[PDB]
Design a protein around this ligand. Structure first.
Ligand code: NA
Lengths: 100, 276, 9
């Protein structure tokens, strides 16, 4: 039984501008086994209208998933990705930095 | 340049919770074109790119027929493997299969492959010559021998060397508008002071296809991994990819640092420099 | 196109 902890990236599809429609992505990669829970958060409350690509994997057999939701960035609002896997002793929350 | 077609299959057992999860997806290069998920509504093999939608009912009925066969095979394998290793019924276990073919720039056959994994680790692989097997351990030698007895490599080889490349060419020609493109990376560089003495330079590659890219930082012409933060290449979700590479530099020495970029879509490798 | 010959382990 090999176990691998997810690598996590939160970023947007397009360069982020205030008040202008975009996609917020959470990319989760390099994990094993495949059961993983992933949420996108807006000011800390979960966003329902999120989509995810079909499970795949790399040459080393670890899995990967993109989750993504349509959104408009604003001054006030704070976006984050919450990930849970059996490798993590508690949910890892990764914040959206515009430059990252 | 070089192209490929690949299918990936994941089978996950569900202790106490009935039938195993089964997922399959097809790719040409870095573009997903088909899928079958056991939890989805359709229980059919479904299009994911627009250029596979134009294949008839004969194709969909057959791929559905065949992916359900793959599904049944992995259903069987999860239980067989559980016995081969004498694992209790309590734990979920994972099986993975990957097979496919590479064609070169003339679209003729370059290589073929077939790997199979259990619990995240090699179980059995077809060797490069497409004619024999490599078995990770004693239980996988059983498999090796069943698959030898029934001469599976000969029939798999024919697939990879024939059917696999014929259909890959078909898909490349049908989806030419999206599959035979290289999008050059859009590069830019950002600057973030840390202190009065150090600063971060980040080199960005955006909107590129395929995903294969190289982003390296150099100092006075020399390789420079020390102090370099490098994210894994990531999907944008519109079919292009993104990446960045960073370095921490002494303030007022920013011009010593160059960012080099290598991509299929670029005539010459790039070289960028934070100019003020 | 998928392969029609997968065999059990
Ligand atoms: Na064989």
């Amino acid at each position: 039984m090999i176990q691998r902890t997810p690598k996590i990236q939160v970023y947007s599809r397009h360069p982020a501008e205030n008040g202008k429609s975009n996609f917020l992505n959470c990319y989760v990669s390099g994990f094993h086994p495949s059961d993983i829970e992933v949420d996108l958060l807006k000011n800390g409350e979960r966003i329902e209208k999120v989509e995810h690509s079909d499970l795949s994997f790399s040459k080393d057999w670890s899995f990967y998933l993109l989750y993504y939701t349509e959104f408009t960035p604003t001054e006030k609002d704070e976006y984050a990705c919450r990930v849970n896997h059996v490798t993590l002793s508690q949910p890892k929350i990764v914040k959206w930095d515009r430059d990252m | 340049g070089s192209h490929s077609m690949r299918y990936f299959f994941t089978s996950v057992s569900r202790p106490g919770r009935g039938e195993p999860r089964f997922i399959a997806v097809g790719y040409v290069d870095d573009t997903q074109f088909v899928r079958f998920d056991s939890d989805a509504a359709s229980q059919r093999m479904e299009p994911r790119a627009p250029w596979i939608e134009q294949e008839g009912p004969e194709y969909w009925d057959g791929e559905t027929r065949k992916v359900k066969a793959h599904s049944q095979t992995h259903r069987v394998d999860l239980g067989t493997l559980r016995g081969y290793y004498n694992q209790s019924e309590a734990g979920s276990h994972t099986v993975q299969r990957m097979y496919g073919c590479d064609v070169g720039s003339d679209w003729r056959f370059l290589r073929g492959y077939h790997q199979y994994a259990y619990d995240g680790k090699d179980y059995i692989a077809l060797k490069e010559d497409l004619r024999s097997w490599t078995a990770a351990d004693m239980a996988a030698q059983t498999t090796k021998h069943k698959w030898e007895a029934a001469h599976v490599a000969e029939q798999l080889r024919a697939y990879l060397e024939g059917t696999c490349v014929e259909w890959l060419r078909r898909y490349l020609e049908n989806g030419k508008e999206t599959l035979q493109r290289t999008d050059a990376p859009k590069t830019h560089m950002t600057h973030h002071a840390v202190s009065d003495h150090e600063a971060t330079l980040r080199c960005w590659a955006l909107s590129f296809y395929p995903a294969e890219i190289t982003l390296t930082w150099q100092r006075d012409g020399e390789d420079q991994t020390q102090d370099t933060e490098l994210v894994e290449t990531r999907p944008a979700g519109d079919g292009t990819f993104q990446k960045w590479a960073a370095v921490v530099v002494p303030s007022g020495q920013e011009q010593r640092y160059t960012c080099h970029v290598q991509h299929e879509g670029l005539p010459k490798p790039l070289t960028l420099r934070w100019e003020p | 196109l998928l392969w029609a010959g997968p065999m059990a382990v």
